[PDB]
Design a protein around this ligand. Structure first.
Ligand SMILES: *[C@@H]1O[C@H](CO)[C@@H](O)[C@H](O)[C@H]1NC(C)=O
Ligand SMILES: [Cl-]
Ligand code: NA
Lengths: 27, 251, 4
């Protein structure tokens, strides 16, 4: 139910050092 | 992973290391898709041309890891396997079509800050996200060049159009595969490599912020060669089989 | 060939 939401990132409202690159690729 | 960087702690909490017991060695990557099911490449478990045919008690998995070699107390979990399941139409003779396997843990693993499952895509997520130019992420403890890292490596790579994938290789590509990597004109490099196979190609959904495993590191010709691309098992296309194995367990 |  909680799959794919990382305890040390999404669950704490923190982003990792390169995930922005993925987001920007969709545009 | 070629031309990647060190993962952050907990960056890929679904990452699994598949370990050979005898001799002790890293075999492959894998991914945690629930508390008791691990996804990997079939060729990690079964590849007769190189005399590979592992049984459950030949292997173990290590979950929650960061360091390639150190035992990480109170962080990592070492699990035995109850049963391996290989896709019944896995084509090891030809081109690794349907290169996918499931491994059932002997006991479910407890989740933690370091151990947490990835999502599998549904039809809409696959249709939306598996498009050329969109980037996903590959992770592993494999070779740094076509030489092993101290800690888990990560690189983001773009999905490549099928005709470009096909023109890059004489190997027969099927719709159960996709390829990813930079083109020679894009000025960036990166690839999975030997030791990374079986590990996950993941995408973060812009719609719900969840990480989905779209691919499994499957095959390639060398690593990070100009004009070559890495090939990945298309997880969504094989999902009915995954669901069947999981659903029939104990029934 | 194969990832391995
Ligand atoms: C793998 O090993 C098992 C156990 O001995 C055997 O039954 C099977 O034939 C082997 N698989 C292949 C495809 O060679
Ligand atoms: Cl299927
Ligand atoms: Na390349």
């Amino acid at each position: 139910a909680d799959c794919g939401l990382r305890p040390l990132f999404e669950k704490k409202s923190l982003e990792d050092k390169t995930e922005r690159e993925l987001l920007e690729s969709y545009i | 992973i070629v031309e990647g960087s060190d993962a952050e702690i907990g960056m890929s909490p679904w990452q699994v290391m598949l370990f050979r017991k005898s001799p002790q060695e890293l075999l492959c990557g894998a991914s945690l898709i629930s508390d008791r099911w691990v996804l990997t490449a079939a060729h990690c478990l079964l590849y007769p041309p190189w005399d590979k045919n592992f049984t459950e008690n030949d292997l173990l998995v290590r979950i929650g890891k960061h360091s390639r070699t150190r035992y990480e107390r109170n962080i990592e979990k070492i699990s035995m396997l109850e049963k391996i399941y290989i896709h019944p139409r896995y084509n090891w003779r030809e081109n690794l079509d349907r290169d996918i396997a499931l491994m059932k843990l002997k006991k479910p693993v407890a989740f933690s800050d370091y151990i947490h499952p990835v999502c599998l895509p549904d039809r809409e997520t696959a249709a939306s996200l598996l498009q050329a130019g969109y980037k996903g992420r590959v992770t592993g403890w494999g070779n740094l060049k076509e030489g092993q890292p101290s800690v888990l490596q990560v690189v983001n790579l773009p999905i490549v159009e099928r005709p470009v994938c096909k023109d890059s290789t004489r190997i027969r590509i099927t719709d159960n595969m996709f390829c990813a990597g930079y083109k020679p004109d894009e000025g960036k490099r990166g690839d999975a490599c030997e030791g990374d196979s079986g590990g996950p190609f993941v995408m973060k959904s812009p719609f719900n912020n969840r990480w989905y495993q779209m691919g499994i590191v499957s095959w390639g010709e060398g690593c990070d060669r100009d004009g070559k691309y890495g090939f990945y098992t298309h997880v969504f296309r094989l999902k009915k089989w995954i669901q069947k194995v999981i659903d029939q367990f104990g029934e | 060939x194969p990832x391995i």
